[PDB]
Amino acid sequence: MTMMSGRPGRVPLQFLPNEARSLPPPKLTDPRLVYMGFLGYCSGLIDNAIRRRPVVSAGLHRQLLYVTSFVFFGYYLLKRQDYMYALRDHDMFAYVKSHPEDFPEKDKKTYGEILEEFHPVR
Amino acid sequence: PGIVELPTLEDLKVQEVKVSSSVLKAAAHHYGAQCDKPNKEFMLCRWEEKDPRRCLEEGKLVNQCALDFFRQIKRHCAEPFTEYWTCIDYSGLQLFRHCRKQQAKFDECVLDKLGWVRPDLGELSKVTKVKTDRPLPENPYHSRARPEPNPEAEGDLKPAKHGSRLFFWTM
Amino acid sequence: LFQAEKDRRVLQMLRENLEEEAIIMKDVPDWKVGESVFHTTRWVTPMMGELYGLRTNEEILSATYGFIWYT
Amino acid sequence: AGRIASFLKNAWAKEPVLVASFAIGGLAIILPSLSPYTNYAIRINRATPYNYPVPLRDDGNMPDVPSHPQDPQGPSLEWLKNL
Amino acid sequence: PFFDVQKRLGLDLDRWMTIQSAEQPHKIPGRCHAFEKEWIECAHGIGGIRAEKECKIEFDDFVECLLRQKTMKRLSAIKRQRDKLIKEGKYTPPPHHLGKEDPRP
Amino acid sequence: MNPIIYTTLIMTVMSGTMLVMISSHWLLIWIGFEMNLLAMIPVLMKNFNPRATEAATKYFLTQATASMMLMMAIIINLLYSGQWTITKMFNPVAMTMMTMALAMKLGLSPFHFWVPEVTQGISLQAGLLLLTWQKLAPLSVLCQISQSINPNLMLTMAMLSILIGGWGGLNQTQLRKIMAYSSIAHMGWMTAVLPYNTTMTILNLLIYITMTLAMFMLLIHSSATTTLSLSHTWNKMPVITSLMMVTLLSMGGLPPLSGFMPKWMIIQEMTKNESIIMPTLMAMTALLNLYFYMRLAYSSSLTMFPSTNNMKMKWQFEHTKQMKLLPTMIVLSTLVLPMTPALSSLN
Amino acid sequence: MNIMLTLLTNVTLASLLVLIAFWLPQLNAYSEKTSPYECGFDPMGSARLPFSMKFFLVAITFLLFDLEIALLLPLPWASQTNNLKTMLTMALFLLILLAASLAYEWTQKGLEWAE
Amino acid sequence: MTMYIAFILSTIFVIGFVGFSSKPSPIYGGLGLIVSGGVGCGIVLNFGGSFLGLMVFLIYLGGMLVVFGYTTAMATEMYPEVWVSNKTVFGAFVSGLMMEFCMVYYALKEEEVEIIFKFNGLGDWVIYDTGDSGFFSEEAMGIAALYSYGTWLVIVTGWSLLIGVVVIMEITRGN
Amino acid sequence: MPLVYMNIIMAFAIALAGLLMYRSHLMSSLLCLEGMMLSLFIMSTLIILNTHFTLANMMPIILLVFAACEAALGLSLLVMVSNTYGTDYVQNLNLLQC
Ligand SMILES: CCCCCCCCCCCCCCCCCC(=O)OC[C@H](COP(=O)([O-])OCC(O)COP(=O)([O-])OC[C@@H](COC(=O)CCCCCCCCCCCCCCCCC)OC(=O)CCCCCCCCCCCCCCCCC)OC(=O)CCCCCCCCCCCCCCCCC
Ligand SMILES: CCCCCCCCCCCCCCCCC[C@@H](O)O[C@H](CO[C@H](O)CCCCCCCCCCCCCCC)COP(=O)(O)OCC[N+](C)(C)C
Ligand SMILES: CCCCCCCCCCCCCCCCC[C@@H](O)O[C@H](CO[C@H](O)CCCCCCCCCCCCCCC)COP(=O)(O)OCC[N+](C)(C)C
Ligand SMILES: CCCCCCCCCCCCCCCCC[C@@H](O)O[C@H](CO[C@H](O)CCCCCCCCCCCCCCC)COP(=O)(O)OCC[N+](C)(C)C
């Protein structure tokens, strides 16, 4: 079952609709971006170790490129993920607002009027 | 699902044009030049109504126009037309090409007697206009009322409340 | 002209079939005569089993394979 | 320009069939784009009336549509009789 | 899964051949052109789930045109009753159903 | 074989898959499958020997049968509704035949016999291609018709695939057959959640493809096709064996590794329906795959097996060819669990 | 109907000729007379043994080249379309592709028979 | 009920299919497939498809010639099997014939759902067209539309045929 | 459906069954594959002619083309197997197990 495959107004291969520009972009110090940079640094270290080079010192340009590439991809990945979650919430709220019969707000009862069974522990 | 309405057998009777295919082919060009208006009216009715039961009077008018045309041809150019359609009829493909003398004589006869000019090449295949008092049908397909669509997406996009909200994650 | 006479021929065959079926199918209890099989009320082209369904097999053979077998 | 001429002469001396085939294929490939009668063939194809021309309803605002086949309006096939 | 490259670029690689009501050469119509046209128009834009219920009538008519099951059922019922009537000798079929008609052009 | 011809054949395989993925007409999808198979057959025979010829013949027979059933299902669907568009598949018999044909193409149990045999009979590069790229087209078609799918048949085949993958993998000393049974079990996991959520199918497919690529590239790096030949790799390149051990742990599904994420999300999705018993059985069964991954880890990384004298000569030389994407594949196979909410971008 | 009658007539005439050939003359069959002919000496092996095909590769190419004939046969009708530029481009594309396949197999010694 | 020609042709089609599916020998199997191709050409001809029937007959004749050569080269033995030379082949052949006859009787005397749907018969004349128009063959126009509408189909088909030539050369290379 | 449709579908089922049960010769199974292709051609042609779908008249030609490609592929593989064993028996393809 595909929930969002055919939502009206969806452009086939866009990856970032113009509507997404109305959302605050992720901060450059976002911990998820830092974790992506950590992944890139780990990839650089593993690249050094597999090629039988000094793991920490062998190629600084290669390690920098690894970290930069992972951060660069992660930024747009996070933007798209946040856009999808915003879309989900927007649709949920619109549907609840347009179908009041299926989401009734029934009367609130205080705990002084609700009869709860007591189960002794003994 | 309802009964099908059909005309009575009496409503379907009409004076019949009972000439063979070769006679019709021999006279076709002048017939399309002379009886154009009722034929175009009938074809417009037929292609607009999409129902043969609604264009019966037009078919009768087509038959009457064809009968008048052939009565005139009989009254004025009997023998040349007979020679022409016999020539046309002998051919297995009913070819215009193999009988030009007979066609020329028939054309001269009709031009002098009735002032009939044979249509030029490319003229009978023209798309023409018909002026009719028949109202344009509004629902020729008998369509039902179309269902209404899902309303639309509306409003400004705000960030998801509390993030993804998937398990432990706060973002 | 061919279109007009084809329309008359099809309508005549349909009317003949309707009348003969009304004669035949009055014996059974719950058979609406001339009842359609489509929910829509617009004209539908006959299936040629509905025009030649009550006629002799020579007519059926000529109507079905007449053009294919003419060589 | 000098080695290819020798190649052409050698091919004509050893494989005339292939030389003729390639020349014919190249001519067939390139000539139709340089011919003025290609559009004439297209027009002849477009002028063949396979189906019936359904007439248009007169709304009183179509001067360009004839009211009769012999009227001066509409397309003409006079170019075809001179071909 | 499905990358709608055709929709994104507007190419029409194969959509021209998907349905019977789509621009045949020389304007030759399909046998069930009107039924498919009505079913498509009725179900357009409402989604697959809604369409399966709210366009059931048009789809049923289209399938009836396609396969013609109810038509042969009705014809065979009529012919069975006619044969039963003639076997007991109570029909006397008309002369125009036996080849002695008066044909019209 | 000429490198130009090899590149042309690879592009034809990928062109068939892309034609399957972008088409709207059933005929074009069938054509994509035919083109993919036609180009794939010679790639399996690139290194010519009787085993490769046998593998190619078995693959051709299985896939040709599957495509014949696919075309018949398409034609039946056309007969009962004059539609060529890939949609809800208006006929149930046609849908059943379509499901069986796609299952045959994927290698889902009961039709799973060909996969171990073809994988063992070809080279590691051909096995990489067969077990990674060749899953995309049938899975995409299954995703596009997921609504009309019958849950009882698909779930039966998925559970059978998980069971048979575990049981068959338990018995293998050849690495290619182990990979094939692992592939069968992962295909079962992929198809179990397909009627409920295709995003989970895509996520599981991507994670499995990453782990499989990492495993096959590690195996190509250390030229081992048997367990005993892999038991020598510690005395030549210990880092390779350590990375392979961690990747094997990830394949098993142990948290906090990335392998655990698809199983976790599929279990959650199935419990969002009622569906309680099936995920429990699926996890209990995946324990078998974990067992034989752990046995491989015991043999190659956690203990040291005896070596031979001639390994000393190998110590003096380096690996000439280098796989540029192997470090990224290993990192994505292992350390990706904290980025789980990013799966929202898949739908 | 007419073509079926023609087929029936021709097959019947051939069958009647065979029947007359086998029932009119005097038959004197004995084992030496009916033995296989190999120029007066008995054959060594069986004629049902495998017989090598030196042109096997050309035979497979005939299967593929035969299907392009089915693609080219509708060409007389395709010349009547309005968009003659698209049709002519596609007819030449198919024929160029067919000549390229012949050129490839020719240069790779695919037309030479096995020895 | 009109002369039962289409039903007889389809029955002979099924009989030839049973003939080659019992697998007596490749020489015999090719003969059965040739007979099936002929009757299928006839069946399609009786529906207006002259071009398609003739084309499929020609294609299968060429294919079976290649198959005959290949059978003589690679699929022979001292005593080739016929439908009565082996209990397995004869049993499969008789089982197929009896299954076909049972299905024919079952669907002809009753009106029952075999597997997919039901069928009463009446001959395939009933569902015909009674369409009256044209100076052209609709099938011919549809097939000729491959060069104006089917550009994508032409591209993929030509590419696949060229790739097939390359593929057979690669497969039979050996080494 | 009419009787002809059931007959063509029965022919397809028989050819599939024929392919599924192997005797000794590989070539027989290839013949069964071609038979399935022919049955599909006939069925699709009948359906397309009955519904007067003009643009669908060209699909069976494409089907025949890819059937020819499939048959060529199978024949090449048979050539290789026979060159390896001197026989096209499916019993010889047993080097790889499950
Ligand atoms: C959760 C919280 C966060 C945690 C994150 C996850 C864990 C950490 C990240 C993981 C990946 C990172 C490293 C990847 C490359 C490592 C590969 C490697 O071989 O390393 C050797 C390498 C030594 O090589 P060398 O120095 O060139 O010379 C010695 C020779 O090479 C001698 O080498 P040799 O090859 O000759 O020796 C042979 C040896 C070589 O074999 C190995 O070295 C094994 C390494 C495998 C890498 C791990 C696989 C991929 C990552 C998955 C981890 C999963 C974690 C989740 C939990 C599951 C546990 C597995 O093999 C064996 O002896 C067999 C022993 C069998 C034991 C099996 C266990 C192996 C798996 C254990 C993995 C545990 C995690 C990583 C451990 C640390 C590794 C360095 O180690 C290093 O020196 C690098 C490590 C330190 C780098 C980070 C330092 C950062 C800079 C300092 C400043 C910090 C900034 C702070 C900011 C604030 C300002 C002050
Ligand atoms: C094991 C780790 C998995 C990693 C997988 C590979 C990661 C690197 C690959 C880079 C992806 C490049 C693609 C983006 C370029 C533009 C293409 C874009 O237009 O594609 C869009 C699609 O976007 C892509 O799907 C997003 C790709 C991002 C995948 C990463 C998510 C992995 C899950 C969380 C694990 C953490 C990942 C960390 C990465 C380092 C089109 O949307 P749409 O045509 O309408 O969808 C078709 C499918 N439908 C309709 C059936 C739904
Ligand atoms: C060009 C194509 C069209 C031509 C049209 C004519 C076609 C003719 C039909 C084809 C057959 C021609 C052959 C003519 C020779 C006769 C062959 C046979 O029929 O005669 C004998 C048939 O007789 C049988 O042997 C037994 C005798 C009759 C069997 C009794 C069956 C019950 C019939 C009732 C008979 C009672 C009186 C009949 C009048 C009412 C067979 O004898 P046999 O030696 O082996 O064969 C070799 C013949 N020799 C001797 C000439 C060399
Ligand atoms: C982004 C990367 C690009 C390069 C990779 C391309 C990969 C695919 C290969 C070719 C691209 C396909 C695009 C062409 C699709 C064909 C349809 C489109 O082009 O329109 C046609 C235009 O046709 C043009 O001639 C363009 C086609 C020319 C093809 C040249 C050969 C290219 C193929 C080479 C690659 C294929 C494999 C290798 C074999 C050589 C029809 O136009 P028209 O007839 O007005 O309208 C039809 C509708 N009617 C019927 C109502 C009138």
Ligand SMILES: CCCCCCCC/C=C\CCCCCCCC(=O)O[C@H](COC(=O)CCCCCCC/C=C/CCCCCCCC)COP(=O)(O)OCCN
């Ligand atoms: C530009 C449009 C192209 C399309 C039109 C062509 C249609 C189809 C024609 C091509 C069919 C396939 C081509 C076959 C290629 C043959 C390759 C080959 O191996 O050639 C040798 C022969 O060597 C050659 O290559 C012949 C010469 C080079 C090719 C022939 C000429 C190439 C083009 C020359 C003319 C170009 C255009 C003409 C301009 C005329 C100048 C005024 C064959 O001989 P063998 O069988 O090997 O002999 C073995 C026994 N000892």
